[PDB]
Amino acid sequence: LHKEPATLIKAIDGDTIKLMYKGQPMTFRLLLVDTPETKHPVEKYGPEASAFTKKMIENAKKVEVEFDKGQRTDKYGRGLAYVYADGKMVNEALVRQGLAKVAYVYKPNNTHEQHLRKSEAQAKKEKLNIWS
Numbered sequence: 240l241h242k243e244p245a246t247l248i249k250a251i252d253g254d255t256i257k258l259m260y261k262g263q264p265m266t267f268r269l270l271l272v273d274t275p276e277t278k279h280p281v282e283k284y285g286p287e288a289s290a291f292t293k294k295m296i297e298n299a300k301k302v303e304v305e306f307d308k309g310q311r312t313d314k315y316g317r318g319l320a321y322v323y324a325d326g327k328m329v330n331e332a333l334v335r336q337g338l339a340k341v342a343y344v345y346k347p348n349n350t351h352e353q354h355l356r357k358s359e360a361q362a363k364k365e366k367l368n369i370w371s
């Protein structure tokens with residue numbers, strides 16, 4: 240895997256972000272995590288998860304996306320990646336706060352699965368947010 244640059248256009252919620260990627264606007268969806276729902280007919284921690292992601296990505300000097308080894312888009316045309324804000328993975332950062340659960344683990348796009356699971360287990364042990 241490798242990291243590629245991208246530019247924030249707009250944070251939609253905890254796990255979905257509009258980025259300019261190779262000079263094209265695209266919606267990206269965070270691999271291997273689910274933040275609580277706030278759009279579809281809002282769940283506990285959804286607003287919190289959304290605020291966390293917005294803050295973390297708006298404050299970055301540099302945003303990067305890292306696709307995994309399989310599909311690079313989902314059925315909705317959203318890019319599927321690990322997103323990094325100044326070298327810090329947003330997917331991990333949410334899970335580590337108990338603001339997302341490890342989810343949608345679809346092979347072969349599971350390269351950081353164990354890494355994320357370890358962060359979720361610490362968020363659980365610490366009773367944070369979703370685990371409170």
Ligand SMILES: Cc1cn([C@H]2C[C@H](OP(=O)(O)O)[C@@H](COP(=O)(O)O)O2)c(=O)[nH]c1=O
Pocket residue numbers: 255268269270271272273313314319343345348
């Ligand atoms: C994260 C992820 C989501 N999705 C799809 C699965 C879910 O489809 P369905 O809506 O048909 O269940 C939806 C979950 O995304 P959200 O959590 O944004 O709703 O997006 C993928 O297909 N692959 C992925 O890697």
Ligand SMILES: [Ca+2]
Pocket residue numbers: 254273274275276
């Ligand atoms: Ca979600």
